Structure formats: C-alpha cells, structure tokens
Structure 1
Amino acid sequence: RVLQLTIGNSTITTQEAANSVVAYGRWPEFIRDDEANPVDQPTEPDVATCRFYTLDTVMWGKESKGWWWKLPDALRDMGLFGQNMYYHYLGRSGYTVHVQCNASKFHQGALGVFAIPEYCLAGDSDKQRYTSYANANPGEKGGKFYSQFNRDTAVTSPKREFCPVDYLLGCGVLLGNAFVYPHQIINLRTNNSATIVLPYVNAMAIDSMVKHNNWGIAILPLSPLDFAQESSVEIPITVTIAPMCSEFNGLRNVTAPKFQ
C-alpha cells in the first residue's frame, strides 16, 4: 500500500500513501492519430529519460504568503530535458508534480497545491501587458505572492515585472473559487505528500516550449503554520517534477534567450 512510485531510474517511496490525482481523468500518452499518413518517427527521449528532477527548497515560515512556478519554464536549468527543449522547434510533455512537506505531530497548517492551465498573471504598472521576458520567466527559483497591490511609480526605469496578490491569486479570481482546478491539500494533520499527474492541455496538437508555458503551479498556505508557542518556525517545502511521455520535433540551431 506504501507507494513504490518508480518512473525511469529514480524512485519515490513514502511513509504515507493516500491518493494520486490524475488531472481531468486522462493519463498522458503520445499523439494518437489513426488518420496519420506519414509513419516517420520523431525524436522521443522516452527510453530512459523520464526522471524526477528536484527544484529549489523554499522555507515556509509563519508570515510567508505563497509561491508560484511555471511549466516547462522551471525545467530549463537542469537535465538533458533542458537541452532538447532548445534544439527542437516544438514538443509536448506531461508532468507529475510531487510536493513533499514534512512536519511533526505538533505542527499544524495546510497548504494547497494547484495546477492552473494557462496561468496568466497580472502586471503592476499601468502600462497594460507590459512585462519583460526575464521577469516573466524567473525559472526554478519561482516567485512569491504579496499582501497588497503596490504598483510601481518609477517611469524612467519601469520594473516590468509581476505583482500578484494572493487572495486574488494574481489572475483576478477569488481564492475560494480556485478549487475547480485539479488540486490537492497537504493537510499536515494527516498526510505529507501531494502528487498530481498533469496531461498535455493545449489547443494545438503540439506547440513550442520556449515561448509558451502550459501549466502553472501555485502553492498557497490556506492555514498559517504554528508550532507549540514560538513565533519563529520554518519548515521546508520541496517540489519534484517528472516529464512523462515527452516527444520533440524539428531540430534547428540552439537558441539562448537573454535573462539579464
């Protein structure tokens, strides 16, 4: 019953195994076209390269507000997946975001792990849709939410970066309405893990990965953390992503975008 969850060479075991949300009920697979006239085969790194890559470790304090990442933006730093994504013009993938966050029996609190498809955040300056590339793709280091909306006033040097608000979730929706996304709740009373299988959701059959970002992960502490009686307490959160059933197409020369 203890999940010996093994994909590729790495292995995710557990101390508690409860559930595994498959988003929208569809397990990922390749392109299934029965009306396909060309039978030539694309470049698929699927023989041993479905591995669990591990992002940075963030520290969930008592007054921390949230974190957010993008996909496949977070995987461009490490792995051989980060190299295939640059040489190939277009490709698709599916993910298994696994978020572990351990605590003792005396801690409390509860995270909420979402997976928003097409996660468009909001800028800060009054210039509309005015956001640079390097500030809109922070990479595996992620970004953090805020309490109040503080727009920027520096006009000669505009910041050109996001300022999401946590209870607005950045987009503009409320947070209580944000459970229609495929989600999971890391309630530190009962469980300490959260795995979400993400299929390929996009309008096209296959689309570019340098410019477009399909899924967006957002971790919100729904209840604030509390240890026994102290006012300083920090537990770590670690995120783990595995690209399942990837395929690529159309080689070209390498592209290195600037990240200032």
Structure 2
Amino acid sequence: KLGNSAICCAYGEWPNQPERFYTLKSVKWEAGSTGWWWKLPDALNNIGMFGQNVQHHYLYRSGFLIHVQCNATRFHQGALLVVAIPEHQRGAHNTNTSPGFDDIMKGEEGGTFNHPYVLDDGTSLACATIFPHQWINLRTNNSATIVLPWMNAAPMDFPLRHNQWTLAIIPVVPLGTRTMSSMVPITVSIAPMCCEFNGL
C-alpha cells in the first residue's frame, strides 16, 4: 500500500522527493495472445503526478515497483512469463530499417509482441529468465511482483528520449478452458520509487 491508491527485488537491489500505484488499463488474455509490453517510464509519462513531474522537469531518477495480477477461475490454465528487460532495444522483422519513434514509444497502451519467441530482438524467450522475472501459473498463483532499480550507466536520464526498463508479459502456455472462447484479464500496476526530478 503506497500513497492513496490501494490494490521480488531485481538482482538483490533495493532503491533508497514525492512518495502510489498507477493501475494501467487491463489487457485481455485469450488463446491467440502473443504478449504485451510496456516501456518505462514511457507508460507513465502522460499520467498523473508522475506525468506532471516528467513534463515540467528535465531529468528523472526513479525505480519502479510493478504488480501484475491475472484474475481467473480454477478452470482456467496457462502460464505467463512476467519479465522485466533492461534496455530492450527492439529489432524489426525482415528489414534493415531501425524501428521508428511510433514503433517504440507506445505510451500507456503499450505494445504487443510480434514474435515473442525471439523477444522481438533476435534473442530467445527460453533464456529470457536471465532477467528479473516471475511466473504466473494460473494453476498455482495469479500475481507477480517485480522491483526495478535505477538501471542506468548515467546518474540521471531523459524520460522522453529513453526507456530503461521494459515490462513484458508473455503467455508461454496459452490460455485454456473447455469452451475455447474465454478471456482472462491481466492488470498491471506500476508504482515509481524515489521520484527524483531536476530542472523545473
């Protein structure tokens, strides 16, 4: 419970100034889903107190606390890989041109994995557990929580030009039930940690 809004550490790091969850729109998970991604802080630059701090200051320095919750019955099955990818330089498929500004900076709506098997950058989803990650096996649990530190070589950074973390939610085992028409909502809540801003 942070702020007024109510509802594991990456690499063993705990980040230590305004001090709440920004619940994004629920995405709807079906059998044909490939995945979802949100780049941070691009998902939060147009929202609320953090958006007023971004659009009026010039440098940002903050960690992130992400709670992904996937609410289903006991007759649903499926596994998600909720993985946070630092510096997720996306590649484009079958072309030599780099992805544009529209292909990367999707805002609050986020994006969809085109080829989640290669994480859309020629790497592998199988080895994607080298990142900070949690699994949502609907048989077992329905939620995931990832702490994200300040991931930068630089001390402070530009929020409108660069996205340090990418939260990815990839269905490894697809959504299943008997009458294959069911949907399961996934709700993402992102709380920034230690919101340091400069250059008012």
The alignment's TM-score, normalised by the length of structure 2, stands at: 0.95
Partner of 2:111: 143
Which residue matches 2:9? Answer: 22
Q: CA RMSD in A?
A: 1.3
Distance 1:133 1:123 in 2: 12
Instruction: Return the offset for 1:125.
Output: 6.2
Do the aligned residues in 1 keep the contact of 2:61 with 2:197 (CA within 8 Å)?
yes
How do 1:69-218 residues align onto structure 2 when only pairs under 5 Å count? Answer: 69-124=38-93, 126-129=95-98, 131-146=99-114, 165-218=115-168
Residues in 2 aligned to 1:166 and 1:244: alpha-carbon distance in whole angstroms: 29
SS in 2 for 1:140: coil
Tell me the percent identity: 54
Separation (CA, whole Å) in 2 of partners of 1:134 and 1:88: 23
Secondary structure in 2 matching 1:94: strand
1:235 CA drift (Å): 1.0
Alpha-carbon distance between aligned partners in 1 of 2:83 and 2:38, rounded to the nearest angstrom: 11
Superposition deviation, residue 76 in structure 1: 1.8
Counterpart amino acid of residue 15 in structure 2: P
Change in 2 beyond 3 A, CA 1:71/1:58: same
Count matched residues. 200
Deviation at 1:126, TM superposition (A): 2.8
**Equivalent residues in 2 for 1:207-246 (5 A)?**
207-227=157-177, 229-246=178-195
**SS in structure 2 at match of 1:139:** coil
**Superimposed CA distance per residue, residues 142-186 of structure 1 (whole angstroms, 9 cap, x where no aligned partner):** 11123xxxxxxxxxxxxxxxxxx1101111111111110000001
Higher helix share: 2
Q: Where does residue 17 of structure 1 map in the other structure? A: none
| Partner Cα distance (1:225, 1:166) in 2 | 16
- Unpaired stretches in structure 2, ≥5 consecutive residues: none
Q: CA deviation at 1:236?
A: 0.7
Corresponding position of 2:22: 53
2:24 and 2:85 map into 1 onto residues whose CA distance is 19
Higher RCO (CA 8 Å, separation ≥ 6 residues): 2
Question: Which ranges of structure 1 fall in alignment gaps of 5 or more residues?
Answer: 1-5, 13-20, 30-43, 147-164, 252-260
Q: How far apart are the structure 1 equivalents of 2:125 and 2:191?
A: 27
